[PDB]
Amino acid sequence: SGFRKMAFPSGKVEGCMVQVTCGTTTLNGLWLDDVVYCPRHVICTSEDMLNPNYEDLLIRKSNHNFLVQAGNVQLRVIGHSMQNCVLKLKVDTANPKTPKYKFVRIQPGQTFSVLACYNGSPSGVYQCAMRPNFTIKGSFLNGSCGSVGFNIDYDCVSFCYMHHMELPTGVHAGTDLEGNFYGPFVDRQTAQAAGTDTTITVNVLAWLYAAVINGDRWFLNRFTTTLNDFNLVAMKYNYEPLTQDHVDILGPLSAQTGIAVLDMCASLKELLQNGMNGRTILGSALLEDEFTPFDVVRQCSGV
Amino acid sequence: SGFRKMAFPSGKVEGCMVQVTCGTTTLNGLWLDDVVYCPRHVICTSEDMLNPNYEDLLIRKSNHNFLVQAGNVQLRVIGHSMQNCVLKLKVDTANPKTPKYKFVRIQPGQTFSVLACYNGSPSGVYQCAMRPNFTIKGSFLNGSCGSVGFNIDYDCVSFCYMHHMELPTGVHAGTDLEGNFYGPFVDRQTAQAAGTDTTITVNVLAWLYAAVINGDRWFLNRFTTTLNDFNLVAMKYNYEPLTQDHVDILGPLSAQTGIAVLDMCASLKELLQNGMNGRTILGSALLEDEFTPFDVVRQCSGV
């Protein structure tokens, strides 16, 4: 038993991280087939970051201006293009370690593993959720851009995130692998504020089901509620509205534990209205919302 | 910025996980050079687990009774021995993916990454600490035995843990790669209780330094204390005694933040005596003790 914030095994993605240097800037790139994907602000100087005109800046760049290094192997760049906020550099060599992969744009509330990298070599792995405000609470320093977030389905790596920027509140922002930012953010050094960080309600319910499964059950009460009589309490505490689709997603967990979704909702309402009173749930003194129901089933079933 | 529970990239260890089957039992094994290491209770039946005589049980086993599978490749077993609580099966093929590796027995308070596996294939990665009572708070189901914990120094994988058992309190127990259990535990199905789970004080101080670095500083006070006048409060709350060696280990962090270790100790005393009062530190409502000072420096420096 036991429930942990668990990340996917990262070897398949480790095999795809390279170093991209342009001018003074060095960041990470993702090498799949004969293409290297990287953030486009690799072509910016410290001066261009305030007000970059990426077309004009990119037009002054030739193939040989892009230094791509996989380990110690220098890749030859034979073409380059810009798709939204992502540069795509064509190299002359297909990555021998290219896995079965997809490009997926995940929905808010979904989770994925981030492989934090620096200078094209891996540094660490951790699990993140796409917040309702399209940010992530990660751990990124300078040079971490180009690091990717991904999921794994058997052997297919679904790349969903590439890191671009840290916001003033310390959360992080990025794009999908097609270069489209999650949320309203843009890749320049201006005043950018993320909106209200609301809680992923279905994820908290899934985490409570994981708690029940792993023995923690003090938070279970004799009450029940209705979906509207749960939402009029969730909106007060900045919780995402619970829909019948969320209820059905939580179906298998409710059937495994024998606890109706609305009764667990009553327990969660009691937790929101009275707090933890100094107790913990699965070793946490906060309500955790970065586990999807799929994460819970996968970790409690051994996938 | 940002501070996360971060695990090592697991590809080098993924390349070493195989499936070991004996009779009905199937668990994981670690394939390095021409040797596969696995827990010895792979030779037990459900009946032998209460009172196993591992010499007598192993003596009834021949090489061909050990089915080793790396992916779909069947390894041929050409010898077998028992070292403490670990079986070592000699195979005819050296693992082509054997990394630079060490066998290390870590001290309590140190951390490592666990690669949770089932049927010899990886399932997830997460960071754990060796508690002062020589247990770990992991996530292990049936068939997870043989999963390993490790650290990485540039390119050298230091294997330090192999999982064997879950205790009644839901924490987990295991051996080093030489087969010696951490703590007083034995690999049989008897009444085994871990002792008092005390807190790794130096790790909480390192985590508070990480908090200060990442902007969280509300817990900083105008007070100071002495080491004895901190220990007579730490022992009340079941905190490991702080030694001058722990102070010196925290030296670089204190010099980077400009906060003396004893002043941070006064802040921690205030936290232990008055609680969090509904606040959070680095997104946690509890004092975290599974980050070593090295973990903090590594994550805030980008190693």
Ligand SMILES: *[C@H](O)[C@H](C[C@H]1CCNC1=O)NC(=O)[C@H](CC1CC1)NC(=O)c1cc2c(OC)cccc2[nH]1
């Ligand atoms: C790429 O490696 C890097 C990400 C690192 C830097 C520090 N922490 C991280 O997450 N990205 C950047 O430095 C980008 C530059 C790209 C054009 C987007 N900029 C920021 O992350 C950035 C800019 C600003 C502010 O600008 C006014 C204000 C507050 C925080 C900021 N972060």
Ligand SMILES: *[C@H](O)[C@H](C[C@H]1CCNC1=O)NC(=O)[C@H](CC1CC1)NC(=O)c1cc2c(OC)cccc2[nH]1
């Ligand atoms: C090996 O895969 C497995 C580890 C799994 C099983 C459930 N959770 C895990 O961590 N190990 C075992 O099942 C071992 C068997 C080996 C001889 C040690 N046994 C236990 O983990 C075990 C035994 C008992 C109890 O026995 C009285 C009481 C309470 C909890 C127990 N766990």
